[PDB]
Every structure is written in C-alpha cells, then in structure tokens.
Symmetry: C3
Subunit: 324 residues, 3 copies
C-alpha cells in the first residue's frame, strides 16, 4: 500500500517529473568563433619597447573551437644556418674532437655535429653543430611573464546552436543584446550576464586560478557552454550557461612538465639575401571552448511508453510480495 502509492506515485514524480520522461529529447549542434582583443607592452633585453596585438599573440589566428593566447616568451633573434657550439650538457660536453662524431644527430641535441669539439666558453668545450645559430640560451621563462598585460585581454565568443528535431535555432548573442552593448560590455555575473565578451583574467580567476602565476609557464583553460533547454517553457529561457575549468595541472604534486609551450619562428631575407630567423619559445594559455546541451519538449509517446514501463513495477510490487 505504502509501497503501492510509493511506486505508482513514484514513476510519476521520479521519472516523469524529475527525469522528464514525458519529453522527446535532442542534443545540441554547435559552432563557435572567437576574437580576442587587447594590447600588451613589453620592454625586454633587448628587443626594446614593443607592443603585441591580436595578430602578434594569437598563434595561429584561427582554430575551430579554441584559441591560444601568448603569455610568456623566450626569443632568439638573428638566427641563420651556420655552425655553433651546442649548449653545455652531459651529452654535449667534450675534450677531444673524437667525442663528437660528424653527422651525429640525436633528437634532443642542438643540431647536426661536424664533429669538432669547440669552445662554448673559456671554461667549457662542446660539440660543434650545424644549426640555426645562435642557439637558444638555456634559461627560465621570465617571471613576471612578458605578456602579463594579457590578463586584461577580452574575448568575444560567438556561438551558434541548433536542435534539429525541434527546428530550433539560437545564438549566444541574445535577442535583448544589440550592437552598442557589444561596443562596451564585458561579461559579469552581476552587471553584464548576457555579455559574451569575457575578460581572460576573469575566466581563469573564476576557475580559481591565478593568471599571473599561470602565465609564466602557460596552461590550458576550459570554457564550457551548456545549452540545456526545456522547450515547453518559453524560448527566452534556453540561454547558454558558462563554466570555467582548468584542464591541465591534473597532478600538481609534480614539478614535471608544467604548462604549455611550443616553438615557432619568423623568417626574413637579409642583405645578402640569405635567410635569418627569429625563434620564439612561446608560453601561453590555450582556451578551449566546449559546447554541450540537451533540449526536451513535450511528447505523448514517451509519456505513454514510460507509463507502460511504469506500471510493470506497480503490479509486481504486491505481486512480488507473494512471489517469494
């Protein structure tokens, strides 16, 4: 009896109301584009005093569902194909030319050996290599990071979605939004919740992380957009909701392999018309954009079927009381 009304009454509240078994259900089809805005100033030793704008700090300019913002750098300029001593190291140090085999090439080395053992300094000798010389100096990335200004950068995240079963289209620029608003707004939980232009600092902060710390060696940030919509309700709900998680750093006890960095270059031709290269070991945050969602709507079919299933238990409650 209590078991009866408990079950019969349960299949309603539990499955039909709470779990909305009366609803037909779709998953979201999503597309996103992003644009980052902001300007960093750096004075280093020595490229001098320099600005970095969007075309400088987003590598590459375009990716589908993510963007990478440069935070820190180690820059080696005026490289050319030439010979130079490798950086001092147990595998690179030498005394005799015989230590360095010509043509010797190992994945972790600075180039292809000549092989001569040559002075890296007055204190130390190293195997000569054919490489892009000068080699990158061995040093820790600058703290504070050169691109600290990037905490204040903003990103417009534009997101189109559709729910095919329901022929329902929407965009995360809401209908109450307009051009002006985007001329000024920056997303805020309190004053600007419908602004899809987020401050990078706020993104990482809301994930309980410190941009300036994280900017030194770089990292990976998730931006999640959940579109969960009961289409029985007005189309005015069915708004995106935003969470921010840090993706990397899943074993913080390690000092092993922190952050995110990669190398890239800018090539030039010089007077003689021979190539020279600027190599950057860049550190930054990859912002990864992830869209999920499920739309429900009322349908009789799932209702019925779920009731057919529902009573199956309703009868064999008391039937099973005897069935033992």
């Amino acid at each position: 009896r209590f078991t009866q009304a408990l079950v019969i009454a349960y299949v309603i509240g539990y499955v039909c109301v709470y779990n909305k078994g009366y609803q037909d259900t779709d998953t979201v089809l999503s597309s996103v584009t992003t644009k980052v805005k902001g300007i960093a100033l750096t004075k280093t030793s020595e490229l001098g005093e320099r600005i970095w704008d969007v075309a400088d700090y987003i590598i590459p300019p375009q990716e589908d569902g993510s963007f990478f913002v440069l935070t820190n750098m180690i820059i080696t300029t005026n490289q050319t194909q030439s010979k130079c001593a490798e950086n001092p190291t147990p595998a690179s140090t030498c005394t005799s030319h015989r230590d360095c085999k010509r043509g010797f090439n190992d994945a972790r080395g600075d180039g292809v050996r000549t092989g001569r053992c040559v002075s890296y300094s007055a204190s130390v000798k190293t195997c000569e290599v054919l490489s892009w010389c000068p080699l990158e100096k061995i040093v820790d990335p600058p703290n504070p990071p050169l691109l600290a200004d990037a905490e204040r950068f903003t990103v417009l995240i534009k997101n189109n979605i559709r729910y095919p079963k329901f022929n329902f289209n929407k965009r995360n620029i809401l209908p109450n939004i307009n051009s002006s608003y985007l001329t000024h707004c920056v997303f805020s939980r309190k004053t600007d919740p419908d602004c899809p232009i987020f401050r990078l600092g706020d993104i990482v902060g809301e994930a309980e992380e410190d941009f300036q710390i994280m900017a030194v060696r770089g990292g990976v940030m998730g931006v999640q957009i959940r579109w969960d919509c009961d289409l029985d309700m007005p189309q005015s709900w069915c708004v995106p909701r935003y969470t921010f998680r840090r993706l990397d750093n899943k074993d913080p006890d390690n000092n092993v392999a922190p952050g995110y960095n990669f190398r890239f270059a800018k090539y030039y031709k010089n007077s003689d018309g021979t190539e020279t290269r600027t190599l950057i070991k860049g550190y930054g945050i990859r912002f990864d954009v992830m869209v999920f969602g499920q739309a429900g709507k009322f349908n009789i079919i799932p209702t019925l079927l779920n009731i057919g299933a529902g009573l199956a238990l309703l009868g064999l409650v008391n039937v099973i009381c005897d069935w033992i």
Copy 2:
C-alpha cells in the same frame, strides 16, 4: 486477437524489419584531409592587380576536419612600431593632453597611450598611442568582396573510414573512380555524383545561401558526410552521402555580429632592418567537415534477445486485458 497479431506481428515489422533489431551495430571511425584549388584576381587601392592562390587564401594551410577560405579583406600595409593618433571615437577623442593618461591601456583601444592629445585630423583630436602604425582605417568590408572569384574554387575532400567490429575499411574515393576522373570531375548530383571535388559555390548554394552575399562578411558552412551501411547488402552500397548546411546565422533578425573574420599579419624586415607588418582583417567561410555513420550487419544474438523482449508484450496484451 487484432491486438495479438498486431503486437506479435509488430515486433517483427517495427523492431526487426524497420528498426533492424536483428543487426549488430557499429559507429564509424573517420578521418579527412582537404585541398582547395583555384585562383582569385583582385585590383585594389592600392596593392594593384594581384592573384591569390591556395597558399594565399587558406589560413592556416592545414586543419583537422575543416578549412578556411578567405573571401573579403581589409588590408593595412607598412605598419611599424611607432606612435600615432587613435581612430576618432567617443573613448578616443580629446581636447586636453590631460584626457589621455600615459600608459593607459584598454582592451578596445588602438594601443598604449603616451598620453598626449594629438591631431587625428584638422577637425578632430585623439589620444596618441604607441602601436603598429598606421592604424587600420575604419570602414565597411568591400562589397562586392575582393575574393568573389572564390565562389568558383574547388575542394577535394578525401575521407577514410573504418568500422572496427566489421573490419570494414572504405574511402570516399570510390572503387569505380580513377586518377583521370579526378583530373577533371567536379561533384554534381546529376552527372558527377562520385566526384569528391566540390565547387564552393555549389556547396553554399545547395545550402540555399548566396556565396557573394555571404562572402562580404564571411560565415560558417557545414559539410556532412553520412556513411550509413547495411553490411548485409553488397559493400558497393555503403557509399558516403553529402549534405550541406549553414552553421552560423542562427538569429538572422540581428544585425549584431554577422559572419566570420579574424586578423593576421605578415612580417618583414626593412632597409634599416626594423620590422614592418601587413595586417589583414580577413573575412571568409570556414568549411567544417563532419562525418557520421552507423553500420549494421546480421547477427543471431540481437535477433534472439529482441524476440525475448518482443514476446514479453505479446503475452501481457491479452494477459493485461484481464490484469486490470
């Protein structure tokens, strides 16, 4: 009785025949590469008369499951790190130097302020900034778009797929295809259905969109390849099928944030050996390639099980007639 043969007869037609419950079922593993071919000519004011080929208009050259084709541009050439007046704007206009705080930097501004209030023109003064100068002029993207020729571009979409349960491998270059055919063919529903080289114009047109309109501010195009295969049938069916949808523009009543654009640059060293930069605000279409599919095959197990389930209803039709 009618309910009997209706159910007993139903679990067969409905689930076993229509819904193929007698089949073991896999989902597709997919991989795609793409190559775009074509050449655009532009005469602008003034880079002059210029061609754009694949290495000019695909940014970047390589992405996994998508490609971006440049359609329109705003190009600012001969930039260097220097000082210049910001573009006229409620936030940038000034009268007194005191209006412009040195070091002032806001995400939406043209650079880092000096701050001096200087002439932007004879009519107007603006805060000076350290930036890449000259700044980009404020203007609408060219209509017609500079890259209109891109409607006639073609893209080879090569797609490998496998169904691991069934050890079934296939490629969207069909076995009846050959090298010559690819030397000439362009996909057509009527004459060239097995040509996997699609004209961009036809892609967007088939999605009921107008390439030249869409090329002005850019946009996002879905290309869907469904591989749905009943492996009971000959391996000669199990061909890919193509649909084309536009992904963005999901709230067309808005004038807010149309299309797709991003900024990127080309760096050079000049006489003095100081950097100069060409900044492009590029507009284009992102073509996004999406592969789905499910392979069925005959298996007795799903048959049996689905019958065990099937009769469960068959008996309690008439049993439930009494059960009330």
Copy 3:
C-alpha cells in the same frame, strides 16, 4: 534447474562480474599537448645543405589534439606576381593566341590568362597566365623523401584527464616519473613503458607501416590513449594504454590520391620592396591523438537495480517453461 542455476548464477557472473553491473560509470574528460623534437638535414638542388628543426617542420606550430610532421617537399623559390607560361597540359597547350581567352580562369589552372599563347619551351606553347611565377615544376616527390631523418624524431605527448563523478584527476606523466627520466627516456614496451615520449618511427612501425615509404607521399597516423579504470582497484592501475593505427590508406588497391600534402608559403620583401614568395608543396604525416576511457566504481544502486532486472528472467525461466 540447470536453467535455473544457469540464469540466477548467470546474472551474477555475466552482468555483475564480467560486465561489472555493480559499478557506477563515467567517461573521461581529456586534454593533450604535444612537442616534437629532432633535426633533419637536407641537401637539395639547390637550396644546398640545410637543417630543419621543430619550427621548420611542424605546420602549424600548435593544434589541439594533433600535430603534423613534414616528411617530403617540393620547393619553388623566388616567386613573384608576374606573367609566365602555364605547365604543358591538354588544357594548357596552344597554337593560336585565340586558344587562350584573356581573363580565363579555371580552378585547375596555373593562373589568370592574358591570354597570349607563348612558348613554354622550344617544343611546346602554352597559355600565358598572371601568377606567382616561376610556376611549380611538375615532378614526383623525392624518393627517398627529403625529411627521412624525421623517422628518428621524438614527440612528448602530455595528457591530462579527469572523471568528474569520481573527482578523479590524473596525467599520463605517472607519479613514478620525474624530470630526469624525461631528460633521457624514449617510450619502449620493454624498457621504458612509462615514458610518454615516442619515436615517430616506432609509432608508425608498431602500426605495421614503413616510415620511409609512408614519408614519400605522407599519410595519417592515429595515436590512441585508452584510460580504462576500475576505481575499486588502487589508483596506481588506471594508467593510460597506447595503440597506434594508420588512419588513411583504407583502399590500398587504389593508386588514386595517396597520402597527405598541402601547399604553404613564406613571404619576403625584396630590394625594390616587392613581394617574393617561397612555395612549398609539403608532404608529411598528421599524427592524430585520440583519448577514450571509462571509469567504474562500486555502487550499491546499480547492484540492486541490476538484480531486480536479473531475477525477472530467473523466475520466468521455469514460469515460461509452462507459459508456452
């Protein structure tokens, strides 16, 4: 009876033990970054003797969940916007200027026609085009491939994962790993199984492919990381496991459209300050990184429910013996 203990005993072994129906179950959230290390030497005709390092051979430097390594190249240098004869071809050959319509532009041609019919050689005439000239010569990619050294390249694959239900975080740099180890280790099934730095050669070899063959025209390699974890066991299991599959080449009987290649360029300004371009048709392997996994953990609920379901068959074994 045998059917009884067979079923009753079955729902335990089969579903609860083998299929672990007593477990709550999550799917993995994953993130990966990669870094490739190594240096190739090339002597070609004629860019001369040249090294290629990470900034030379990874195009682009950064992608989410994949990386592309250059293996072979065809390089055309000193291109500028100018006129030249198209490469000899049934569609490009001519006798009369009248064969070449000015402005004529077809997706598969070398440029925009002048149109004049001009000498491509002493033997042959071809339509003149406005293009980036000189055009790329028509030739087979070098065998052996210029970048054969890339077989010996290494890639650090760093992978963070979480299982939200279980609040479980881990990284594929295991807790028994340290900095030194990464200073030296390369992944080996036998001696270095916890080294997440893989030799490209070993990746393709383990997929039963030949790097040097595959390097000529390029290809696509899958790297799969399965994290399947029974969290009832110690967190010390729940290690990633690695498989390596080749993704493309799913119809090897074809000579049609082998491998992976794309075109890209490097732009320069010359003396006069007019653009010149190096065009590379690059061939290489796309390494695609794929992370899957399911974590189980003990929960009473799934246990109970699965028993409720389990006995449903247990009773109607002997009940159904009569039910016919």
